[PDB]
Amino acid sequence: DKKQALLEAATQAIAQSGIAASTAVIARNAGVAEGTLFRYFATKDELINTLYLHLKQDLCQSMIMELDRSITDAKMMTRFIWNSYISWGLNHPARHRAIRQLAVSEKLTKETEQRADDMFPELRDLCHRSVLMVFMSDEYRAFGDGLFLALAETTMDFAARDPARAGEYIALGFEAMWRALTRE
């Protein structure tokens, strides 16, 4: 209960304010004592990592349910994964806004990145993963994650504002993302 309420309140606050959002704000919006928040997350760094994992789990659970694992072709599988990301963020704009800030925050621990993958094996190799961002040195993976998230946010913005052409924006954004972030 209170853990879920705190994570939901942290999601809204960071979506609105960035990793800077105050624990006090988060605690009151969750209707708990700030000391109670520290019982769940002793530090802002811990809240960042725990919240990132929470949102990442939610997102990937969404992707798992839309995925058809017959599909082996990487581009097609990647299109489906994109479309599920755009859907997720249109359904949950604060989750997207929060995860975008978390993803590029530089407070994510190697432990946490590790923890993400271990929690959804299905994504590792029911796609055969990647071609996406393989060309980049390790140091620039964060930047490529930022580029992906930038493209996706724009695609969301336009689809939300002009729903009659949502599929068109999604398809154009996909093609942009894929050309940006792959090599043949």
Ligand X SMILES: C[C@H](CCC(=O)O)[C@H]1CC[C@H]2[C@@H]3[C@H](O)C[C@@H]4C[C@H](O)CC[C@]4(C)[C@H]3CC[C@]12C
Tokens 């689809």, residue?
Answer: 159
For residue 44, how many other CB atoms are within 10 A of its CB? 16
The one of a copy of itself, ligand X, none whose footprint includes residue 47, by CB under 5 to 8 A per kind, is none
Q: Is 1 in the site for a copy of itself (CB under 8 A)?
A: no
d(CA 38, CA 122): 33
The one of a copy of itself, ligand X, none whose footprint includes residue 89, by CB under 5 to 8 A per kind, is none
The span of 12-20, 26-34, 111-119, 143-151 binding a copy of itself (CB under 8 A) equals 143-151
Query: Which segments of the chain does DSSP mark as H helices, in order?
Result: 2-17, 23-29, 34-40, 44-66, 74-91, 93-103, 110-119, 121-124, 141-161, 166-181
CB-nearer residue toward a copy of itself: 122 or 162: 162
The CB-of-148 to a copy of itself minimum distance in angstroms stands at 9
Q: Is 139 in the site for a copy of itself (CB under 8 A)?
A: yes
CB-nearer residue toward a copy of itself: 93 or 144: 144
Breakpoints of the chain, after residues (C–N > 2.5 Å) = none
The one of ligand X, a copy of itself, none whose footprint includes residue 173, by CB under 5 to 8 A per kind, is a copy of itself
CB-nearer residue toward ligand X: 96 or 166: 96
d(CA 11, CA 26): 9
CB-nearer residue toward ligand X: 23 or 62: 62
Asked if 86 and 159 touch (Cβ cutoff 8 Å), the reply is yes
**Interface positions with ligand X (CB under 6 A):** 56, 74, 77-78, 81, 85, 99, 103, 123, 127, 129-130, 132, 145, 148-149
d(CA 79, CA 33): 44
The CB-of-96 to ligand X minimum distance in angstroms stands at 8
